[PDB]
Amino acid sequence: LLPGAEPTVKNGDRVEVGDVLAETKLTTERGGTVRMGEDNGSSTHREVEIITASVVLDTATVKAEASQGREHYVIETKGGQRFNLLAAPGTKVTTGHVVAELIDSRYRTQTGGLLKYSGVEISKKGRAKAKQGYEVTKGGTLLWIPEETHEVNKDISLLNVEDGQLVEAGTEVVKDIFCQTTGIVSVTQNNDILREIVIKPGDVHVLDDPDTAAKYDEGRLVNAGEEVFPGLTAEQLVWAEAVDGTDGPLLLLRPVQELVIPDEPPVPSQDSSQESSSRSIRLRAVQRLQFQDGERIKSVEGVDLLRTQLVLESEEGSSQLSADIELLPDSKDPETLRLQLVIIEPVVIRRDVASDTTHGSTHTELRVKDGQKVKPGAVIACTQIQCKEAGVVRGIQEGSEAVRRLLVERERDCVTLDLDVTAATQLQPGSLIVAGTQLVDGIIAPESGEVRAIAPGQLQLRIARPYRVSQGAVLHVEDKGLVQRGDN
């Protein structure tokens, strides 16, 4: 018998050809839905799948695009806001990794910057390299002056653009790169080295004696009409700033904008199963933010600003929190395309094995269908072990939990042997009679074994073979046991 099989017949019942004697029950825990997985022969779809996290997304379409070099797919949300899919539908990831990104129409920023982290309800999770800032959860009143500082090192003689002056892109403050627009120059009387030139063309001015005002005090905090100095009251909401350039210390303003952050980026509705078998997958589009207050941008690039990450916080706690896949079937009856993310587990069904000398025929049978709500601990498969010859079943080893061997008395075992009148000697069902032993008149019995039914002329008996055991032999078997051919 199989290691995990179980007898189904009782000690003494007649057994026919093809009758099932053993069966092993294979069950799957946390059973959500159950797939078809037909095991009939060698069908293409035999690997039964359970599924517990069926997903039916709202309006969000995948399709076939080969644009931008070779090939990739892009998502849309509600009105068409682009959820760019950075990873193929074969990520094999579980959590903590990005699955969609947001566009940066306004977040496509300028070269430099002076970030003022102001009243933004950002997260609290130390960057630790791979975080690119914290996640902005709800609140936003962010302030940013995008001041376009250009970093290049040269000397005063090579500064044909001079310093503390405005000039178009024709002549530049540069020696290795090229300028972009009207180059307001700014050099703080630097010898043999300098810093990032702070070009301030938006709100050029010439105000004098700057570093004594009540508003420009290295931090600004300037409103729409905060008067830095008497006479000239500001009009724009920009920050009042000064640069010690022309004629000793000078004042040059810079335009400032607001980067107010609304609520978390919206995923409209995912019909992903949450309370089905306690597997609750969720996707939260949450925007992120880079370097904090005291790391004002001084480089020259488009510097990628706020980056929305599609968190996949699923359930409360599981193996790597999702143990999921991200393959996409069809969406509905309309042959559209929609990404789906479920939890799968592999269940293996062994191939059928034909008859053999020491084993029997095995047929597995399925008791499930294409889809049905089931409970954890539900039997999926039944592997049935049958017989190859009829007769009686006997020798059911009662044991405790180790029913391993079964015995079937076939018709060939019993042999009809013609003999004497069968007189009233001890000869009764049970007596063991050996070949060559004496009988009613010394007639030789041509067979050996145990007599069961005495006939008027026959003593039909089951065949056996005596094995003489000398005193002191180390026994290797117990009484009433079962043995195979070539066994000690």
Side-chain angles (χ1 to χ4, degrees), residues 269-381:
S269 34
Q270 56 181 119
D271 297 40
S272 59
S273 96
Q274 292 168 359
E275 219 71 280
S276 168
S277 304
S278 202
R279 287 298 157 280
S280 314
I281 64 186
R282 302 111 188 291
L283 270 53
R284 267 213 243 176
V286 181
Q287 44 215 330
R288 264 75 204 172
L289 254 204
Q290 63 244 23
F291 318 95
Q292 263 75 32
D293 292 75
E295 305 94 50
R296 321 297 192 114
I297 304 100
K298 332 192 141 202
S299 324
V300 166
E301 49 201 87
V303 49
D304 272 348
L305 206 84
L306 166 139
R307 225 91 45 77
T308 286
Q309 183 254 323
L310 187 46
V311 200
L312 58 165
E313 26 127 73
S314 305
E315 211 214 54
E316 305 214 332
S318 315
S319 152
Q320 72 247 55
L321 274 309
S322 280
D324 67 305
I325 49 85
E326 56 285 325
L327 287 99
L328 63 101
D330 271 310
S331 83
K332 296 263 112 192
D333 183 30
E335 325 279 13
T336 51
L337 272 83
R338 159 230 74 215
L339 247 183
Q340 169 150 359
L341 186 138
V342 315
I343 293 112
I344 86 157
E345 58 97 356
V347 158
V348 292
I349 273 66
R350 320 298 277 290
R351 219 177 274 277
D352 297 35
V353 190
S355 279
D356 206 284
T357 91
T358 186
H359 279 329
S361 42
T362 76
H363 297 82
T364 206
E365 323 292 343
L366 264 171
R367 306 305 186 82
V368 300
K369 287 302 224 323
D370 292 28
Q372 44 183 62
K373 195 58 147 194
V374 281
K375 321 296 198 272
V379 186
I380 306 295

Side-chain angles (χ1 to χ4, degrees), residues 47-68:
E47 183 85 3
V48 287
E49 182 158 306
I50 187 47
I51 281 149
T52 46
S54 35
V55 187
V56 223
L57 290 191
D58 83 275
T59 358
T61 282
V62 277
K63 78 286 289 173
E65 311 142 276
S67 268
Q68 292 108 45

Side-chain angles (χ1 to χ4, degrees), residues 57-354:
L57 290 191
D58 83 275
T59 358
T61 282
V62 277
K63 78 286 289 173
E65 311 142 276
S67 268
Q68 292 108 45
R70 324 293 184 287
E71 187 257 286
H72 34 276
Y73 305 150
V74 179
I75 313 316
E76 59 254 37
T77 210
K78 314 147 189 60
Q81 157 79 218
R82 268 183 62 183
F83 278 19
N84 289 258
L85 203 68
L86 77 175
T91 85
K92 208 49 73 139
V93 314
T94 165
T95 185
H97 318 120
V98 199
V99 291
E101 95 156 314
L102 214 75
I103 34 177
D104 20 34
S105 140
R106 184 45 259 219
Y107 309 121
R108 214 219 47 205
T109 49
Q110 256 79 65
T111 46
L114 276 160
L115 211 39
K116 195 33 154 231
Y117 265 90
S118 163
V120 276
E121 240 285 301
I122 211 178
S123 306
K124 274 306 220 44
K125 211 61 227 173
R127 218 174 136 159
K129 335 293 175 296
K131 207 53 205 103
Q132 52 142 96
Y134 313 153
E135 346 138 31
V136 201
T137 39
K138 204 63 55 182
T141 144
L142 201 278
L143 292 125
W144 192 45
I145 146 189
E147 189 176 317
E148 302 194 50
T149 74
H150 304 116
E151 168 214 339
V152 56
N153 190 40
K154 8 124 50 118
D155 52 86
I156 48 163
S157 191
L158 291 195
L159 277 161
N160 0 260
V161 82
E162 212 249 327
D163 73 275
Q165 200 214 99
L166 174 130
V167 65
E168 71 257 78
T171 184
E172 321 100 346
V173 76
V174 81
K175 204 178 53 136
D176 182 47
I177 321 98
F178 282 124
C179 180
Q180 54 114 330
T181 46
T182 72
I184 265 274
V185 212
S186 49
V187 171
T188 322
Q189 199 88 357
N190 281 267
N191 54 273
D192 90 344
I193 211 181
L194 216 170
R195 292 82 169 158
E196 15 269 18
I197 303 275
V198 279
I199 285 193
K200 322 204 75 184
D203 263 288
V204 292
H205 218 283
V206 80
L207 246 76
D208 56 345
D209 202 74
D211 208 50
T212 183
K215 318 306 183 288
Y216 157 67
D217 298 87
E218 274 128 45
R220 287 131 320 231
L221 312 183
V222 187
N223 52 60
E226 231 179 58
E227 204 215 55
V228 79
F229 270 154
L232 191 33
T233 352
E235 183 252 359
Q236 302 120 338
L237 281 85
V238 316
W239 253 357
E241 194 80 296
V243 162
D244 10 27
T246 299
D247 197 78
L250 206 76
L251 189 135
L252 297 91
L253 292 155
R254 217 276 169 209
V256 182
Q257 68 268 309
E258 210 73 14
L259 280 174
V260 158
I261 284 304
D263 6 35
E264 269 163 343
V267 34
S269 34
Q270 56 181 119
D271 297 40
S272 59
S273 96
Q274 292 168 359
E275 219 71 280
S276 168
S277 304
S278 202
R279 287 298 157 280
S280 314
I281 64 186
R282 302 111 188 291
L283 270 53
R284 267 213 243 176
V286 181
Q287 44 215 330
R288 264 75 204 172
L289 254 204
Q290 63 244 23
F291 318 95
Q292 263 75 32
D293 292 75
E295 305 94 50
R296 321 297 192 114
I297 304 100
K298 332 192 141 202
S299 324
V300 166
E301 49 201 87
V303 49
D304 272 348
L305 206 84
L306 166 139
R307 225 91 45 77
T308 286
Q309 183 254 323
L310 187 46
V311 200
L312 58 165
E313 26 127 73
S314 305
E315 211 214 54
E316 305 214 332
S318 315
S319 152
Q320 72 247 55
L321 274 309
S322 280
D324 67 305
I325 49 85
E326 56 285 325
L327 287 99
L328 63 101
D330 271 310
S331 83
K332 296 263 112 192
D333 183 30
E335 325 279 13
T336 51
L337 272 83
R338 159 230 74 215
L339 247 183
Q340 169 150 359
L341 186 138
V342 315
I343 293 112
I344 86 157
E345 58 97 356
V347 158
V348 292
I349 273 66
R350 320 298 277 290
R351 219 177 274 277
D352 297 35
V353 190

